[PDB]
Coordinates of C-alpha atoms and ligand atoms in Angstrom, one line a residue:
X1 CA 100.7 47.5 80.7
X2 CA 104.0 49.5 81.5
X3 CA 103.3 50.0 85.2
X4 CA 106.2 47.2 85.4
X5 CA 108.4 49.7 83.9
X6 CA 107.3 52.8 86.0
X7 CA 108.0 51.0 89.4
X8 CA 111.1 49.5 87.5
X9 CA 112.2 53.2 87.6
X10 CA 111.0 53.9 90.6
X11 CA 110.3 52.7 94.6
X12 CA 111.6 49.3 92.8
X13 CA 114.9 48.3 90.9
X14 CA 117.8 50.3 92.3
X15 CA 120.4 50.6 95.1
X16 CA 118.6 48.0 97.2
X17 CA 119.2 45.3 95.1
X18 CA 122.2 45.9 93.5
X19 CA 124.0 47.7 96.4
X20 CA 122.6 46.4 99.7
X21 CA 120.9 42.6 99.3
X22 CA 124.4 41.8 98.3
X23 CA 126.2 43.5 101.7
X24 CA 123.5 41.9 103.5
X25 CA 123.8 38.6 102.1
X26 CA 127.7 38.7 102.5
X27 CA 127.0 39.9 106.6
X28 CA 124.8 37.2 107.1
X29 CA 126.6 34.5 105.0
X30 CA 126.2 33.3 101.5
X31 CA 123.6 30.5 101.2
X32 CA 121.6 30.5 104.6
X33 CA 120.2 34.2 104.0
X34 CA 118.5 32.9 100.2
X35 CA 115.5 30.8 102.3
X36 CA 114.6 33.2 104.6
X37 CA 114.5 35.3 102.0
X38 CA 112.5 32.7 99.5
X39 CA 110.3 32.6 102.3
X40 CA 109.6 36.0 103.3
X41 CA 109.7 37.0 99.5
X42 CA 106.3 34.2 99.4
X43 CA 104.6 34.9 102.4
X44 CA 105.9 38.9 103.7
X45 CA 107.1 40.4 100.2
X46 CA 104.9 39.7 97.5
X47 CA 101.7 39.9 100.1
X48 CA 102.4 43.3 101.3
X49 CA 103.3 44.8 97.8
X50 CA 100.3 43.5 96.3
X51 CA 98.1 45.1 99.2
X52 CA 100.1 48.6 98.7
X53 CA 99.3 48.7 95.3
X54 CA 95.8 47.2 95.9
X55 CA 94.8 49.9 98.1
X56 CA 96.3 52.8 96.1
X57 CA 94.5 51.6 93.9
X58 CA 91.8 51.3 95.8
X59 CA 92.1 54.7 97.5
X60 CA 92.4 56.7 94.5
X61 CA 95.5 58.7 96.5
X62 CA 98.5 58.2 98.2
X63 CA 100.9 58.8 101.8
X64 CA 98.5 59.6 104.3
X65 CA 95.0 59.9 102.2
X66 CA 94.8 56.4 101.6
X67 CA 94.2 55.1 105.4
X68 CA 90.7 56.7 104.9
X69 CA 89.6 52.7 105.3
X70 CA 90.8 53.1 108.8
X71 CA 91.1 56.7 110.1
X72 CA 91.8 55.6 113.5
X73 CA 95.0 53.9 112.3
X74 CA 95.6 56.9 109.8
X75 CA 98.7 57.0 111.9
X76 CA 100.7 54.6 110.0
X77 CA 100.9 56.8 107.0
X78 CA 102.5 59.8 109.0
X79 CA 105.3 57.1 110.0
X80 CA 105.8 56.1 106.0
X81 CA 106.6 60.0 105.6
X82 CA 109.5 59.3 108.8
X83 CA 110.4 56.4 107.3
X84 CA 110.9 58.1 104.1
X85 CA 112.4 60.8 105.4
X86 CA 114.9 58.8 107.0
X87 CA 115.4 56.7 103.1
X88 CA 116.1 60.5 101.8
X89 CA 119.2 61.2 104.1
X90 CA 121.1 58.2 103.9
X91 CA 120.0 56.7 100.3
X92 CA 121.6 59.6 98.7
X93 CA 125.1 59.0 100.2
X94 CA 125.4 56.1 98.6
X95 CA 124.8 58.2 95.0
X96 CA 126.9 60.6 96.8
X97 CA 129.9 58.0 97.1
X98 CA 128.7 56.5 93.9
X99 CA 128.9 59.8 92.1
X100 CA 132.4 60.4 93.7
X101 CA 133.3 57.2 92.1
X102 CA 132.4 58.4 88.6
X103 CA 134.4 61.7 89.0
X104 CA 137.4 59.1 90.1
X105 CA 136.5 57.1 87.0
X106 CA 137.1 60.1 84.0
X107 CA 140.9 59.3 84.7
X108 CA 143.6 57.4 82.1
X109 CA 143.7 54.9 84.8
X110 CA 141.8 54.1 87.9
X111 CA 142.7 55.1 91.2
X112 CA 141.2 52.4 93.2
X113 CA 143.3 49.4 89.7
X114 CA 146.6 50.3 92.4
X115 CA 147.5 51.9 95.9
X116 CA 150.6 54.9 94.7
X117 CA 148.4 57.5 95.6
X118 CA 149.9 58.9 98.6
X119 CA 146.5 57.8 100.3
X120 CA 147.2 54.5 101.4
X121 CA 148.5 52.6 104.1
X122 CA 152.5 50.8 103.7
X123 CA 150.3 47.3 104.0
X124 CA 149.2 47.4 100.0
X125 CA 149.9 45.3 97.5
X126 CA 148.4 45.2 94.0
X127 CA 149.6 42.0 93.7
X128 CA 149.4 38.6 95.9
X129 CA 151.7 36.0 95.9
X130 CA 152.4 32.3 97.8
X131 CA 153.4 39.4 104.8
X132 CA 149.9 37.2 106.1
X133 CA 146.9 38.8 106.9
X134 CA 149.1 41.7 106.7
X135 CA 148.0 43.1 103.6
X136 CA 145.1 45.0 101.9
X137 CA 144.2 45.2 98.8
X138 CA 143.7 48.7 96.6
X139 CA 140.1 48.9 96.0
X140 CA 139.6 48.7 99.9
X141 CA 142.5 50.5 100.4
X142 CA 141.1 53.6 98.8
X143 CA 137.2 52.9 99.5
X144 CA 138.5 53.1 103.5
X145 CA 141.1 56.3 103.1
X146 CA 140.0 58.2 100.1
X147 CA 136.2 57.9 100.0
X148 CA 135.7 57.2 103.5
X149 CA 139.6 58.3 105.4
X150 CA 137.5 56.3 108.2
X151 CA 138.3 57.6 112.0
X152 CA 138.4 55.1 115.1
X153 CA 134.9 54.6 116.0
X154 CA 132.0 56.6 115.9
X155 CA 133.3 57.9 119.4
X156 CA 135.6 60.4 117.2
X157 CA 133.9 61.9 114.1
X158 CA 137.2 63.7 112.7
X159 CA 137.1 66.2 110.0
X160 CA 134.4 66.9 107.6
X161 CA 135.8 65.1 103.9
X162 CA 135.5 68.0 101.7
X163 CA 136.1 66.1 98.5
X164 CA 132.6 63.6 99.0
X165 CA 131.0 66.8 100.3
X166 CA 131.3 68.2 96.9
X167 CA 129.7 65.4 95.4
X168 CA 126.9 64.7 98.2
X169 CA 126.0 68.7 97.0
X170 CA 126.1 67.9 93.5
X171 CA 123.7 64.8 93.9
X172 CA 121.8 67.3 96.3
X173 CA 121.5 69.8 94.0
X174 CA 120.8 67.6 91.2
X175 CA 117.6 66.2 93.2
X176 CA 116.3 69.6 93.8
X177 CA 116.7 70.9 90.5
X178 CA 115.5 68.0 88.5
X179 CA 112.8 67.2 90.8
X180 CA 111.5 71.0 90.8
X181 CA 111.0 70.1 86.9
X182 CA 109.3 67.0 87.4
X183 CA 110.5 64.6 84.4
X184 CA 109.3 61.9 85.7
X185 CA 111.5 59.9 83.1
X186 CA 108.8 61.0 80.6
X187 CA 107.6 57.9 78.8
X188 CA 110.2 56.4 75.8
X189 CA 113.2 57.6 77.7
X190 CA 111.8 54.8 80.7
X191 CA 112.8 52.5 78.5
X192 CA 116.4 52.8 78.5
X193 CA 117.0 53.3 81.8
X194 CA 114.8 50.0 82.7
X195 CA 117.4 48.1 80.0
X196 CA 120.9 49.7 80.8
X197 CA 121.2 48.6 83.5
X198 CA 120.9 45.0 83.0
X199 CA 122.9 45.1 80.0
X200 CA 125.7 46.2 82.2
X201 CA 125.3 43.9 84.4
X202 CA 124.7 40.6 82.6
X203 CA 128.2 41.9 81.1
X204 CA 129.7 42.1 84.7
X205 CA 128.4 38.6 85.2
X206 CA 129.8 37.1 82.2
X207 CA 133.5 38.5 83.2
X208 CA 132.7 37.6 86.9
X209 CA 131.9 33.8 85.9
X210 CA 135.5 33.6 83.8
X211 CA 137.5 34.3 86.8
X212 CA 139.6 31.5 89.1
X213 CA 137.8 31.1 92.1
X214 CA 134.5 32.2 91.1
X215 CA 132.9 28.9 90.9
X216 CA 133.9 29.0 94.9
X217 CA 132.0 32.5 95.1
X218 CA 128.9 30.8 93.5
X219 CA 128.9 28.0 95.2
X220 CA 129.1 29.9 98.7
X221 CA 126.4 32.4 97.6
X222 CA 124.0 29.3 97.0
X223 CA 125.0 26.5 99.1
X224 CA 123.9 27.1 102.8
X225 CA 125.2 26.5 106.0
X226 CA 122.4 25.6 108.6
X227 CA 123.7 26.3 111.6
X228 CA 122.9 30.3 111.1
X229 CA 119.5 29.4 110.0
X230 CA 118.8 29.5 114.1
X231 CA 120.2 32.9 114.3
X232 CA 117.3 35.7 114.5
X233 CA 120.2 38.3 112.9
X234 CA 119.8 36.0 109.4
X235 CA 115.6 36.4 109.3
X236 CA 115.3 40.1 110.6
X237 CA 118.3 40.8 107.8
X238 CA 115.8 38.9 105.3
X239 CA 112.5 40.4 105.9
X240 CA 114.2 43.7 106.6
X241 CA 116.1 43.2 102.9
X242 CA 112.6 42.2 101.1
X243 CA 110.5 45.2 102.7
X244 CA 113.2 47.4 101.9
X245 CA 114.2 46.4 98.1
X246 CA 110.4 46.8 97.7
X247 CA 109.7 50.0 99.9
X248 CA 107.4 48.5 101.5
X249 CA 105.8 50.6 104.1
X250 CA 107.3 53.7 102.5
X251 CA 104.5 55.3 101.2
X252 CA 105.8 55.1 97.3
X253 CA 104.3 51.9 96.5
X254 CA 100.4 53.3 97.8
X255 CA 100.6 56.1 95.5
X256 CA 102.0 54.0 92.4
X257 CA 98.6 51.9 92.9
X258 CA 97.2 55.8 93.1
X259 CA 98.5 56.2 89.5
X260 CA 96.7 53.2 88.1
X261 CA 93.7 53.1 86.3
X262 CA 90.5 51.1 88.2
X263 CA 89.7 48.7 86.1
X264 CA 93.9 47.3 86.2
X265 CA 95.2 43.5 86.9
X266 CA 97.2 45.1 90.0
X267 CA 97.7 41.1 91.0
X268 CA 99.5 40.2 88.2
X269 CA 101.3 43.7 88.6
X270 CA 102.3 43.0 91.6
X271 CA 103.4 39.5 90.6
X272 CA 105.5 40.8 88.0
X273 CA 107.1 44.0 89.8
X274 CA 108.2 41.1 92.9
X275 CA 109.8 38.7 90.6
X276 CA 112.0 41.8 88.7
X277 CA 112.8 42.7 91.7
X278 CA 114.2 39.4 93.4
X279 CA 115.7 38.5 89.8
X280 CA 117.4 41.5 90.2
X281 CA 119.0 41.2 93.1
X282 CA 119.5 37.4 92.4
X283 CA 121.5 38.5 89.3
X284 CA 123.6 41.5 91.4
X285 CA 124.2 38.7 94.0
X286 CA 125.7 36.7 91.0
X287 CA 128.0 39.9 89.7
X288 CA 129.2 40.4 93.4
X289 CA 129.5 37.1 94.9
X290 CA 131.6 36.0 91.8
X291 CA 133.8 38.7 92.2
X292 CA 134.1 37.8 95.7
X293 CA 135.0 34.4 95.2
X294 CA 138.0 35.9 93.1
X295 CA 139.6 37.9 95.6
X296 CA 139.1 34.9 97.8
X297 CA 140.8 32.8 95.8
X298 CA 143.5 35.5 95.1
X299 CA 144.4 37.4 98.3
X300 CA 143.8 33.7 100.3
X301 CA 141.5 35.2 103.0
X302 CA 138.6 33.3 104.0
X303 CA 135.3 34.1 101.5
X304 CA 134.2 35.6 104.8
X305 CA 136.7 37.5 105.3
X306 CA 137.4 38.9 102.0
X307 CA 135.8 42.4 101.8
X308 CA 133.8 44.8 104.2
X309 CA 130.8 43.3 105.6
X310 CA 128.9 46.5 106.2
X311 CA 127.9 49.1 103.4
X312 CA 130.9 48.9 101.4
X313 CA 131.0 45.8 100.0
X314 CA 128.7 47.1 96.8
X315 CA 131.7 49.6 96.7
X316 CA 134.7 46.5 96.9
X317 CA 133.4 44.5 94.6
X318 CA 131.9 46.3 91.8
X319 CA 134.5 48.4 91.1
X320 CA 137.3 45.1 91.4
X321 CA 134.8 43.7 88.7
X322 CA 135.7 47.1 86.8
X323 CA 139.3 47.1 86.9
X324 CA 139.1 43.1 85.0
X325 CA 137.4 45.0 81.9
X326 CA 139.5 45.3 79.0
X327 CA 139.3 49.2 78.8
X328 CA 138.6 50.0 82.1
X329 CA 137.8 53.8 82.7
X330 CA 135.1 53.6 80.3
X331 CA 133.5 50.4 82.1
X332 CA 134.1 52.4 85.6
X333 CA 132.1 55.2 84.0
X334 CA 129.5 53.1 82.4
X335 CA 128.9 51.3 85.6
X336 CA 128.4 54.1 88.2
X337 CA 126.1 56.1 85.6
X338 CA 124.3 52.8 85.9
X339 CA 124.1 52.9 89.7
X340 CA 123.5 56.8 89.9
X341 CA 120.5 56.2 87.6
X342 CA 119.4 53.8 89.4
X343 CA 119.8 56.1 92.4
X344 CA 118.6 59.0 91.2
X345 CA 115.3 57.7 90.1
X346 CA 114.6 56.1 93.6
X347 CA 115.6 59.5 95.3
X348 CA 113.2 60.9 92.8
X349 CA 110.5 58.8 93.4
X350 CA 111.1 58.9 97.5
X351 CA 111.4 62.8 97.5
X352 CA 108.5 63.5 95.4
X353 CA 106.4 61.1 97.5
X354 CA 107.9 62.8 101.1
X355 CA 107.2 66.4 99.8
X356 CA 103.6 65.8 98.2
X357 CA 102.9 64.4 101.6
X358 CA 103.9 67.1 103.5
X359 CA 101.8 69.4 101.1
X360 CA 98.7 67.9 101.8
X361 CA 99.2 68.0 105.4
X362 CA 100.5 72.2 105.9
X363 CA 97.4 73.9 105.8
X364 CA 95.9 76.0 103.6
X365 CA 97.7 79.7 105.9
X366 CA 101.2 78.1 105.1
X367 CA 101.2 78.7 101.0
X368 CA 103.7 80.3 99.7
X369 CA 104.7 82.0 96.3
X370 CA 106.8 78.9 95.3
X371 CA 105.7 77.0 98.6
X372 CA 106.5 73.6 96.4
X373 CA 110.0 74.9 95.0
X374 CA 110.8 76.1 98.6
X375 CA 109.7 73.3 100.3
X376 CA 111.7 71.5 98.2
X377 CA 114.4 73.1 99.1
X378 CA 114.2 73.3 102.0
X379 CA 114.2 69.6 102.7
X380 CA 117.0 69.0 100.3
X381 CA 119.6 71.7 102.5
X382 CA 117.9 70.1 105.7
X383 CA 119.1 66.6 104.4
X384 CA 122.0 67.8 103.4
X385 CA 122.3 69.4 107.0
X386 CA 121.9 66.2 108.3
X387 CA 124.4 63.9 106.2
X388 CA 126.9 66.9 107.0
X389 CA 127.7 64.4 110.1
X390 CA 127.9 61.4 108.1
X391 CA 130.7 62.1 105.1
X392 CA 133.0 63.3 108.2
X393 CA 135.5 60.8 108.9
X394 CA 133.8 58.9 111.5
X395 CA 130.5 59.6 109.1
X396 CA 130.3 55.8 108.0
X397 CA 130.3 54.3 111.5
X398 CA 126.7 57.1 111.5
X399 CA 125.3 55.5 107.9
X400 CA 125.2 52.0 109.9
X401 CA 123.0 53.3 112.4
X402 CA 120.9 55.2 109.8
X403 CA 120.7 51.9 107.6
X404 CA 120.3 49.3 110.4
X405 CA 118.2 51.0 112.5
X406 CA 117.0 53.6 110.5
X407 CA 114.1 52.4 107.9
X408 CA 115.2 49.1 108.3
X409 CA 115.4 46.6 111.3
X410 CA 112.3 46.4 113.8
X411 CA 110.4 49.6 112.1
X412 CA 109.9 48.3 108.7
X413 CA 108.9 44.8 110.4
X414 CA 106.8 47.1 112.9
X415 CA 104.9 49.1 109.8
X416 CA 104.3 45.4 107.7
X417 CA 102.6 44.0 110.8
X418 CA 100.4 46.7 111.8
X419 CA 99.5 47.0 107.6
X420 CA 98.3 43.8 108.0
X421 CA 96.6 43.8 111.2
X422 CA 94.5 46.8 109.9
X423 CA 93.6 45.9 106.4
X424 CA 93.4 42.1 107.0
X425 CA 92.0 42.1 110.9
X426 CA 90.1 45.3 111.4
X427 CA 89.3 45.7 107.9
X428 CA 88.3 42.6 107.0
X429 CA 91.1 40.1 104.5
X430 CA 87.8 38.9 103.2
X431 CA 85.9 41.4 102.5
X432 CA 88.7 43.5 100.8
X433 CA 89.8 40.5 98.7
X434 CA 86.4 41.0 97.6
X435 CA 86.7 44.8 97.0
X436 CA 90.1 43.7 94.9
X437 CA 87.7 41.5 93.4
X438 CA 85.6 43.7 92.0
X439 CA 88.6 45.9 91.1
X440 CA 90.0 43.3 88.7
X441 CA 87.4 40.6 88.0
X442 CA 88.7 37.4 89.0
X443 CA 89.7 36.2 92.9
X444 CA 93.6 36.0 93.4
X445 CA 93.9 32.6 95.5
X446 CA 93.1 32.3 98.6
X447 CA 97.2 31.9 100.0
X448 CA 96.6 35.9 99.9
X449 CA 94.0 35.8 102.4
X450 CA 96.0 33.4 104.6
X451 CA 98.9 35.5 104.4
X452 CA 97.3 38.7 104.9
X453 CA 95.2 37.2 107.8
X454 CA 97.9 35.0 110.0
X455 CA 101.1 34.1 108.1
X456 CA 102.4 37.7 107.6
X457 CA 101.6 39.2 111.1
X458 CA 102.7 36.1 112.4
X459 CA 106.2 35.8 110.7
X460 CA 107.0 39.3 111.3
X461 CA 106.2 39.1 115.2
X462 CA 107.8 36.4 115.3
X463 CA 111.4 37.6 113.7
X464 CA 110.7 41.1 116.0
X465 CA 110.3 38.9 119.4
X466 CA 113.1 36.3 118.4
X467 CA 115.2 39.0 117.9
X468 CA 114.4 41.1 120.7
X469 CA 114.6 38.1 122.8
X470 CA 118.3 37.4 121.8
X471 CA 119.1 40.5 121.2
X472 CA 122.9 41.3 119.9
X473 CA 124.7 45.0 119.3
X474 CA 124.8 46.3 116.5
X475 CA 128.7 45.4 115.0
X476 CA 130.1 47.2 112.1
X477 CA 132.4 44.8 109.8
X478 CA 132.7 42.8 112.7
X479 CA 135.2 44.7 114.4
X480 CA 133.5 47.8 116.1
X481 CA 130.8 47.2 119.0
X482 CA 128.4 50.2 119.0
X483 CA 128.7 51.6 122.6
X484 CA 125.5 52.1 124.5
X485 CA 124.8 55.4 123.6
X486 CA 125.4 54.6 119.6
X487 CA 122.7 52.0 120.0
X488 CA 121.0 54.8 121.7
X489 CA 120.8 56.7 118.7
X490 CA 119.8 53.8 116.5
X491 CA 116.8 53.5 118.7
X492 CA 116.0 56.5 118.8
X493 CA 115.5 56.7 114.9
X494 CA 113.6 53.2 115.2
X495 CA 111.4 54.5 118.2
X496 CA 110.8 58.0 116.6
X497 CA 109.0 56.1 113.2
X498 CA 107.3 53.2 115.4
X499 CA 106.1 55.8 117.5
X500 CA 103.5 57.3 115.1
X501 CA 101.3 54.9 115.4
X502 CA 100.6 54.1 118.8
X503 CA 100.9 57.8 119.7
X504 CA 98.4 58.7 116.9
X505 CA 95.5 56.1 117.8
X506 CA 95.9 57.6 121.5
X507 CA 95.2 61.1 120.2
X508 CA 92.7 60.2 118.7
X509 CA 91.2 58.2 121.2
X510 CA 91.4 61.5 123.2
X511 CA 90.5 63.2 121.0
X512 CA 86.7 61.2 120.3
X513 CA 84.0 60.9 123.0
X514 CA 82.5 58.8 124.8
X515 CA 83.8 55.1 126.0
X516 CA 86.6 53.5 124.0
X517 CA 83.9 51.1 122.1
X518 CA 81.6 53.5 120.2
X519 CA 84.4 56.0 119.9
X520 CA 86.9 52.7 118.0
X521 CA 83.7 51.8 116.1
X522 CA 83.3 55.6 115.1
X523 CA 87.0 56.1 114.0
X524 CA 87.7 52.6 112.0
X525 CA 84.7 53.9 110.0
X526 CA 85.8 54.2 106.5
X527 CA 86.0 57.6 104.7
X528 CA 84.8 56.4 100.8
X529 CA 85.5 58.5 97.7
X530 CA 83.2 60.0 95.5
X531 CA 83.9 57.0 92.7
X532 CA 83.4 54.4 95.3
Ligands
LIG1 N1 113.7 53.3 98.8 C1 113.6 52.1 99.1 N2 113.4 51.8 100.4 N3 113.6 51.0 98.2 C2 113.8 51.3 96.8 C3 114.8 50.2 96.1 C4 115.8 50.9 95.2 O1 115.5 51.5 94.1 O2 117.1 50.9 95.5
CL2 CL1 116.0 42.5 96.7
NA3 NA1 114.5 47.0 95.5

């Protein structure tokens, strides 16, 4: 089948493995984040995207519809839509910063290949030589004053960057109109963008490996170093990174089982979508952590201490890749065409899924003339309302709490676990592997059933508890603690999704009669579909 390709386009391949498993790596250290997240990928990742698509499957429908099996816990698809929600303001930032890249690139030379811009501090050089740690090169140079012109802390916002909010419109504007059309990629033009990308990347790679100091890059991305193993910040990064890269829990990958036909092998689908996915973000790990391992063996910082350690790193190290090219304007604009593809079509994907969502839920008195058009719309200028605060100068310091805390962190590890608990405890792990059964023919080994059943609630507890247990605050690039009431704010993103479920079940606890036994055995009673 092509389903491979459709996700490939879609809740799958994008940003999140080519712009934030390689930040993420880099904050938690080269080697020691690869086996947590070999093993989450085994028993968290794979598991959880083959029940999504299972039960969309399943379900016939997507978002909200598809807890049917389990009304009572219903709740957990209103918190995708949150979740979602949340994906929708920040993800398109990046493209936003992206795009502003590829209106930077369309230039006879590059504005980030020197610092002479009139934007940069006195302590750039574009080239090192035998004063210390007194120095910074270009690309940061300008992704930290240009892009970014990044204020103190997020104590003092500063003033609103015009230049980014031009392009944060464009990609905004962009999104509405060519989502009100609905391509959907159509079906040949797929194709294409499921191979560019790679293409341009396996070509970064192959001028990241013929560098000096790469081979030290490599070997710091793969080889680990055990002592952060005990650290809970490397395994909630890990699981976080895998349930995000697969948007898991986001209420994209239920309604891409939706779109399948009944009688599909959804296990080998799954399969197949995981392992594109991790090679993926394997092979962006490469293109970045070679590049790394240049400018560590060329400025003489520490690998550690090479580039930003937050959000930026995608944008300090793909672009230095650029500026090796032989002609490189036209590699600048080939690459960030790649990564606002990539973008686009999981802004796409996300916005379509957040808007048909709120459609089923308004009722029937709230229609309007174009009440899809406006609601689109409306959400895109409410976004855009929101990410107003974040492209301000102090706005960066705000896209850490929105990507830490925000549809990441404890919530995503929150909505995996309770998944699980419902389709594999309250459900039954048995008797839907027997329902998949049916769907598909064969019996998928029985490490799904164990994983479904104990492993993944178990491993995702345990990250949330060890975590919680020694918990540390939130530190951008390892320089700015996030006073209390930043963390505040963080919290009150993660609280506001892992909030829908509890706050659901007790409504509708209220809501039923009777004592809490008869009126739990009434509400987990599953709502079939005509075909079933
Ligand atoms: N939206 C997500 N949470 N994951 C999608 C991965 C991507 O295409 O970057
Ligand atoms: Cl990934
Ligand atoms: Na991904």
């Amino acid at each position: 089948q092509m389903d491979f390709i459709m996700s490939c386009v879609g809740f799958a391949v994008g940003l999140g493995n080519v712009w934030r498993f390689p930040y993420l790596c880099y904050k938690n250290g080269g080697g020691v984040f690869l086996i947590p997240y070999v093993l989450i990928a085994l028993v968290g990742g794979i598991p959880i995207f083959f029940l999504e698509i299972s039960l969309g499957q399943f379900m016939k429908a997507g978002s909200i519809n598809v807890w049917n099996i389990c009304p009572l816990f219903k709740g957990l698809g209103y918190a995708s839509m949150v979740i979602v929600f949340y994906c929708n303001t920040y993800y398109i930032m990046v493209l936003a910063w992206g795009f502003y890249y590829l209106v930077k690139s369309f230039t006879t030379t590059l504005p980030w290949a020197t610092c002479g811009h009139t934007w940069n501090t006195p302590d750039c050089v574009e080239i090192f030589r035998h004063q210390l740690a007194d120095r910074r090169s270009p690309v940061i140079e300008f992704w930290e004053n240009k892009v970014l012109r990044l204020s103190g802390g997020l104590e003092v916002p500063g003033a609103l960057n015009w230049e980014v909010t031009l392009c944060l419109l464009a990609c905004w504007v962009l999104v509405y109109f060519c989502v009100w059309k609905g391509v959907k990629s159509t079906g040949k033009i797929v194709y294409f963008t499921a191979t560019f990308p790679y293409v341009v990347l396996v070509v970064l790679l192959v001028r990241g490996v013929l560098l000096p100091g790469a081979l030290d890059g490599i070997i710091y991305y793969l080889k680990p170093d055990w002592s952060k193993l005990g650290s809970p910040q490397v395994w909630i990064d890990a699981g976080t990174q895998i349930f995000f890269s697969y948007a898991i829990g986001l209420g994209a990958l239920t309604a891409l089982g939706s779109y399948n036909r009944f009688n599909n092998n959804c296990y080998k689908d799954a399969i197949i979508l995981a392992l594109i996915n991790s090679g993926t973000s394997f092979f962006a790990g490469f293109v970045v952590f070679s590049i790394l391992g240049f400018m560590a063996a060329e400025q003489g910082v520490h690998i550690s201490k090479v580039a930003e350690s937050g959000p930026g790193l995608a944008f300090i190290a793909y672009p230095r890749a650029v500026t090796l090219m032989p002609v490189a304007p036209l590699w600048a604009a080939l690459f960030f065409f790649m990564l606002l593809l990539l973008g686009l079509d999981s802004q796409f994907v996300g916005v379509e899924g957040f808007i048909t969502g709120l459609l089923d839920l308004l009722p029937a008195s709230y229609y309007f003339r174009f009440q899809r058009e406006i609601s689109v719309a409306l959400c895109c200028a409410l976004c855009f309302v929101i990410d107003l605060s974040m492209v301000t100068d102090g706005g960066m310091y705000v896209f850490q709490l929105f990507d830490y805390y925000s549809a990441s962190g404890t919530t995503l590890l929150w909505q995996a676990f309770w998944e699980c608990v419902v389709v594999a405890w309250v459900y039954g792990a048995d008797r839907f592997m027997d329902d998949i059964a049916c769907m598909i023919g064969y019996r998928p080994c029985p490490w799904m059933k164990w994983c479904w059943s104990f492993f993944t609630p178990l491993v995702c507890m345990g990250i949330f508890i060890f975590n919680v247990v020694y918990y540390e605050p939130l530190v951008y690039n390892n320089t700015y603690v996030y006073p209390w009431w930043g963390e505040a704010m963080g919290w009150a993103f993660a609280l506001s999704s892992m909030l829908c479920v509890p706050l659901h079940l007790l409504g509708c606890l209220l809501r039923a009669k009777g004592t809490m036994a008869e009126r739990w055995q009434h509400l987990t009673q599953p709502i079939w579909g005509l075909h079933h």
